[PDB]
Structures are given as C-alpha cells and as structure tokens.
Chains A and B, each alone.
Chain A
Amino acid sequence: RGHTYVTKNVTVEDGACVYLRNVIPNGETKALNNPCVLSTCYAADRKVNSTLCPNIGVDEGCHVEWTPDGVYPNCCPKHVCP
C-alpha cells in the first residue's frame, strides 16, 4: 500500500529527531500532519523511516475527498465510494 522513503542526515537534537519542523523521539512512531505521513527516526545513523498514504486508484462509482486537517491517517486522500 503506502510506500516508504528514507532520508539521510536528518537533524537529530538531544536524542530527539526533528524533521521538517516535526520533533519526533527516537523509538516513537508518531502520526504527523505536515507532512501527512507516519514517521519514525533513528538518531544512531540519522535516518528516518517514513511511509506515505497509499496512492488511490479510483474505480467506478467512487471519488476522492481530502482535507489536510488532523494527522495520519485522517489527512490522507480517502477512497470515498458510495
């Protein structure tokens, strides 16, 4: 579903990992809003495992609604199908 992307040389401070102005602890999987991901960092090698919302492929009779309010997974494009 939701792919992942790993960044290198992330700003790690006081054991906490701040990335794109989002402070996340070392062994903490926190849901975020800006950007809308589910992230986890590691100050040992300064890398951040982060996953996106799954890309939506809209089939018949469906449509997509997305509002940036709230954190993952509510900030994800939802495959709303009546």
Chain B
Amino acid sequence: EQTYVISAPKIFRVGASENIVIQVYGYTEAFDATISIKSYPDKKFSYSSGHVHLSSENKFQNSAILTIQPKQLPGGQNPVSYVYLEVVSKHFSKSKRMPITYDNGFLFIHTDKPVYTPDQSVKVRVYSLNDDLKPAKRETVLTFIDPEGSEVDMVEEIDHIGIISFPDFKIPSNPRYGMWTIKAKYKEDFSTTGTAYFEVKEYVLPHFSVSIEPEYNFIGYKNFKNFEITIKARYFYNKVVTEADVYITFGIREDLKDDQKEMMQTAMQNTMLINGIAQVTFDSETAVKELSYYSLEDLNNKYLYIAVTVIESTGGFSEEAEIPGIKYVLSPYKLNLVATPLFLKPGIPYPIKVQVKDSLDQLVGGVPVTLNAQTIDVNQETSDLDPSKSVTRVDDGVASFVLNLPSGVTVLEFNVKTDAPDLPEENQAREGYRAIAYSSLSQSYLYIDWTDNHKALLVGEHLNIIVTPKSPYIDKITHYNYLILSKGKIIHFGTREKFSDASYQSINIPVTQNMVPSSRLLVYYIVTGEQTAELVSDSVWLNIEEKCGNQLQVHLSPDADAYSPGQTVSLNMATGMDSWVALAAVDSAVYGLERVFQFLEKSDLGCGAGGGLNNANVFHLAGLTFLTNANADDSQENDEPCK
C-alpha cells in the first residue's frame, strides 16, 4: 500500500505564511507534487501555490510555505470564507474545503495608568504583531469609546517598528465618568482587534484617608463564624486621627463585574475609633441569616462587600471607604488536572496527575488525595475500582496516579478529592471527570509521553519522548511521524524508523526557540492491511518556560532601597540582540498589570492536553486538518472547535 498525509493548520490565515506539510509513504521513486491553495468552489483562481520535491534523501517529506495574499480576495458584500487546499501529483490528487479567517495579528493597547482624573492626558501606545509574532508594520486606528458607547475619537498612525505611539488623548475638564474603552484596529483588510479599558473618575480631595485591612482575603471554613477587620484612618501621611465614629455596613455580593449588592440590615454595626485603629469582628453566619442561606455550602464563590463610613468627632468630617469583595472559599484547596488527556487508550496505563492549588493559586504540597473510579464498559456493566491515595509532591504540586483498566472500558468516570489532615468532609475539595476511550475501527492505538512531569520542560534542553504503540499488526508498523505545532504553525515534521524487535521507541526531539511557550506534538503511524490503511494518532501538549528570544533586562543605577526627589539616576537596559524597547514609569499607587501571554495564546487553535475520541479528532483538536487516502472524517463545525 502507498499512503500520503497532508497536514495544514485547521484555519488558513489571510496574510499569513500557512505552512503545509506533505508526507508520503510507500513511494520509492523521487517525484514532484505541487501543493496549491485554490478558490471556492470552482477552483478557478489560485490564491497561491508551492512546489515540493519528494526524494529518498528528503525522506519523502517536504513543506510548502503557502500564503494567501490579502489583496487577492474579493471585498464588499462577499469576501471568500472558504478556500480549496489542493495537491497535484502523477499519483494522487485531493482537495478539501478549508476555512479562512482575517483575524491575523495582535494589538495590545498600553495606557500608562488604568485610572485617570479629569484634565489628564491619556498616553496610549499600541503594539502591532503579526501571526508570526514579529513587528507588523501596518497602519492602525484607535477609537476612544466613551462610557455610554459613542466613539469620541479616531486617530491613525502608521507603524514603522511595531510600536505605534499615538498622540496623547486629553480627558476633557468635564468628562463623562465611567469605564472608557479604546479599540485599536487595523485599517486595511484585517479583522484584528485590540481593546483596553481605563476609568475616568473625578478627583475628590479627601478630609482624611480611611484604610481597611481584613484578616485574610478569603473566608474559609474557620473564619466563617468570626472575621477580624482592621479599620485604620489617618490624616495626610502620619497625622493619626484622634477619635472617630466608625459606621460599617455589610452586604453579600454576587460578582465583581456587575456592581449589584444585597445589604444585610441586621448587622450594620458601628464602633468607636480610638487613636487611629478600631477593629471589629463580622460573624458571617448569624449575619447572613437574612434568607439564612441555610449553610456554608451556599454563598460559595460570593463576595462580602464591606462598606465603612468613618465620621470623626472634632471637625464633623465624613469619609467613606470600601472593600469591593472578599470571596467566600468553601475549601482551602483547589484541584485541577495537569498533563492528563481526557481520552482513554484501551490497554494502556491511564496516568492521572492531579494538582492541588490554594486559593492564591500557589501549589501546596503534602496534601493527601484520594481517587475513586467508576467505569462503563461496552456491555454497560459498570465496574468500580478501589480508592487509591496519592499525596502531592511539594516540588511541583502534582500527585501522580496510574489507573489501569480492562480492555473493554470506554468511559471512565473518575473522581479526585482532597483528604486534608484537618478539614472536615464538607470542607474538602472534590472534582469529577469523564475520560472517554479512543474509538478506532481497528484495534490500533497509540500512547506517547515524555520523560517527567515535575520540571516544566525548559528551552535549550532535548526532549526524549517515549512513543509506545499497542495493537495487532504491531510488527508491520514501518514509519512513525511527528508534527510539532506552535501558535498554529507547523514548525516541524519528520520520521523515525521503528525497530521491529522492540515494542516502543524513544523519539528524540530537539527543543528550539519557536516552541516557546506552548507547543503540541502530534505523532502517528500507518496500520495497513486488507483494503485499507489507517492513521493512529496521539498528541501531547508541551508547556515550556516563558523565555524570550530577546530577553530584556532593566536596571537602575545606583540601586538602593530609597532614592531622593530630583536625584539624577541612570536606567541600564541590556538585551540579547538589537531590539527596540518601549518604556513607561507609573506611580505604583494606581495598582492598589499587563499580562500578554494569556492574550498572546489565542493563536494556538488547539484545545486540551492531547488525546481524542478517534484519529481525525486527535488532529482536529490539535488544530490540524489532514488529507489522506485512509480514514478521513470529522468535518469542521468551525463554530467553537473547542473551549
């Protein structure tokens, strides 16, 4: 049998270099194939095409960097939402209806301060990066949207280096208070958008400063009955207020997004402020007895909106201060899964690596974890496995499990629960799940996993991934494969020969710079035989330490725990290569906060940490399409590939 596999990102990106891969098997003679993107549905216009040469020296694999030019598309009423990826050769020819999206690139608006007062200038700059994460150099448009929703500005500034500094925005002297909105956007042919927010609040000179400092930021199992609040009030930086009357109002809250609040007129207690510090205790249980909430089991994920009004005695002044919310936490721990595909390979040890987190999202250790397992076979004869106990290693927060299953298993309904030394049964954290089996028309499966879990693979190292097949016909598997996605681009490919004397094989993968900070590694082979060949694929997710190509580093010279006003100080910037550097220096008081890598990851079209229902689904989850004379299914349903 002679097989061929084409792998292209699931979504072709207008204006991006959509790398396509072609891997053919069985053919021994050198030959040429021209991968081509063609219009829809008549294939009349060739948006682009590429030439590959497939030889024994080339291992019969090659990549053709295609590119849909932005101007080559119609406009107005009907710009194409579908293109035909098409391959030609003297042997085969295949085509598949592929989607295209214009959302290419990223725009990060960066306003210096997040809160402005009337008549301050809004310093706004925009970074423009294309899908390759390189300076875009395209003409951008801002649009300051007032709190009511009407555009009050629009200003275009051409890019030259990727950092597009804009003319400052002057907040009027009588502005419209609320949460304004900036909307950077590309001017031509790209649907890329960027958004930032900044509040415009009127400055009100305060009689004095009232500061609230709660005991903890969360109300767990213990402090649900008593909650010490430290309410300090002071004049202008070290003039202690003498005596004041402190009125406190407490109310339960739903969500920090909408400012709805429900008051509790049963505990609007007030006290006497004495010499600058007055501390009260809030009994959450008896206070919430309005509607009574019937337990600590309720009120979970809710906030305790604290309102404090300090009215001092001497001058008759009044001042108010609040805490926006104190989240109720039902359990001092949170569980989640790491490096576990929610898809089962019948006949393979299913490793479950649960990870325990505090309410601060910090990896706690030494927490015993118990895990039960309810299974559903093909005969629906549900079988229950014994509870296993694993305790979290303090090095990474991962408490490893290995849950072997019989061959006939399809749906494993396993449930992890914390078993803390000091917590009652109710106050423990529990998480259920549901692992489905790899659906294969044959009895062929694949399972791959790399060296260890407690290091978070670092760039520059080498990856020793251990690919283990499990199937009949195992002694006819000739070639493996591996495709290493990143940001939606197929940045690698190859083939490793299988040693027909060994069951598994250690694939050696060189970690490069393109793979930062998250990449997927798809691996598969070809089970062949009677009237059909079969792809059998299993993917993983490689989380790499967030490192730059150009690591930036700023120092202040001289360095000390304190400087003096007007002092002349030097800023020392050192990079890896020739690189522009934007700068900013804001008062640290506005922050009581720029996170790009979370916004810069919306380009990874994948979902989950690997695995899949069937073969085609292991691809469609990793963000690849595929053309193959073997099994091909699982059409787009482009809306919501995975969340």
Interface string of A28-71 (1 = CB under 8 A from B): 00000011110000000000001011011111100110111100
Whether the pair B404, A68 counts as a contact (CB closer than 8 A) is: no
Interface string of A1-17 (1 = CB under 8 A from B): 00101011000000000
A3 to B487 Cα, complex, angstroms: 43
List 20 contacting pairs A-B, 8 Å CB cutoff, sorted by A: A3-B383, A3-B386, A20-B407, A34-B470, A52-B404, A52-B405, A52-B406, A55-B373, A57-B389, A57-B390, A58-B399, A58-B401, A58-B402, A59-B390, A59-B391, A63-B400, A67-B503, A68-B504, A77-B349, A77-B402
- Across the interface, A67 reaches (CB within 8 A) one of B388, B393, B504, namely B504
B408 interface residue per 8 A CB criterion: yes
A65 to B379 Cα, complex, angstroms: 32
Give every chain B residue within 8 A of A68 (Cβ-Cβ): 468, 470, 503-504
Interface string of B401-427 (1 = CB under 8 A from A): 111111110000000000000000000
B385 interface residue per 8 A CB criterion: yes
Q: A58-B399, A67-B504, A68-B504 are in contact. Are A53 and B351 (CB under 8 A)?
A: no
Whether the pair B388, A57 counts as a contact (CB closer than 8 A) is: yes
**New A-B pairs, 8, CB < 8 Å, besides A34-B347, A36-B404, A53-B404:** A5-B408, A55-B373, A55-B388, A55-B404, A58-B399, A64-B402, A68-B468, A76-B404
Give every chain A residue within 8 A of B390 (Cβ-Cβ): 57-59
B324 interface residue per 8 A CB criterion: no
A12 to B220 Cα, complex, angstroms: 60
**Interface size range on A against B:** 20 to 34
A37 to B409 Cα, complex, angstroms: 14
B641 interface residue per 8 A CB criterion: no
- Across the interface, A55 reaches (CB within 8 A) one of B391, B403, B408, namely B403
A50 to B349 Cα, complex, angstroms: 16
- Complex interface residues of chain B between 327 and 373 (CB less than 8 A to chain A): 347, 349, 351, 366, 371, 373
Give every chain A residue within 8 A of B347 (Cβ-Cβ): 34-36
A76 to B403 Cα, complex, angstroms: 11
Whether the pair A66, B402 counts as a contact (CB closer than 8 A) is: yes
Whether the pair B406, A5 counts as a contact (CB closer than 8 A) is: yes
Residues of A within 8 A of B (CB): 3, 5, 7-8, 20-21, 34-37, 50, 52-53, 55-60, 63-64, 66-69, 76-77
Whether the pair A3, B385 counts as a contact (CB closer than 8 A) is: yes
5 nearest interchain CB pairs? A57-B388, A56-B402, A5-B406, A77-B402, A58-B400
For residue B585, give the distance in angstroms from its CB to the closest CB of chain A. 47
CB nearest to A63 among chain B residues: B400
Most chain B beta carbons < 10 A, residue from A58, A59, A66, A76: A58
B175 interface residue per 8 A CB criterion: no
A76 to B390 Cα, complex, angstroms: 18
For residue B223, give the distance in angstroms from its CB to the closest CB of chain A. 30
A53 to B349 Cα, complex, angstroms: 10
For residue A53, give the distance in angstroms from its CB to the closest CB of chain B. 5
B510 interface residue per 8 A CB criterion: no
A64 to B353 Cα, complex, angstroms: 12
Give every chain B residue within 8 A of A66 (Cβ-Cβ): 349, 402
A20 to B351 Cα, complex, angstroms: 23
Q: A55-B402, A64-B400, A66-B349 are in contact. Are A35 and B391 (CB under 8 A)?
A: no
For residue A34, give the distance in angstroms from its CB to the closest CB of chain B. 7
Give every chain B residue within 8 A of A56 (Cβ-Cβ): 388, 401-402
A2 to B515 Cα, complex, angstroms: 41
CB nearest to A64 among chain B residues: B402
Whether the pair B391, A60 counts as a contact (CB closer than 8 A) is: yes
Whether the pair A77, B408 counts as a contact (CB closer than 8 A) is: no
For residue B449, give the distance in angstroms from its CB to the closest CB of chain A. 10
A42 to B371 Cα, complex, angstroms: 33
Most chain B beta carbons < 10 A, residue from A8, A69, A77: A77
Whether the pair B405, A21 counts as a contact (CB closer than 8 A) is: no
CB nearest to B347 among chain A residues: A35
B432 interface residue per 8 A CB criterion: no
B472 interface residue per 8 A CB criterion: yes
Give every chain B residue within 8 A of A20 (Cβ-Cβ): 407
For residue B41, give the distance in angstroms from its CB to the closest CB of chain A. 46
A69 to B466 Cα, complex, angstroms: 13
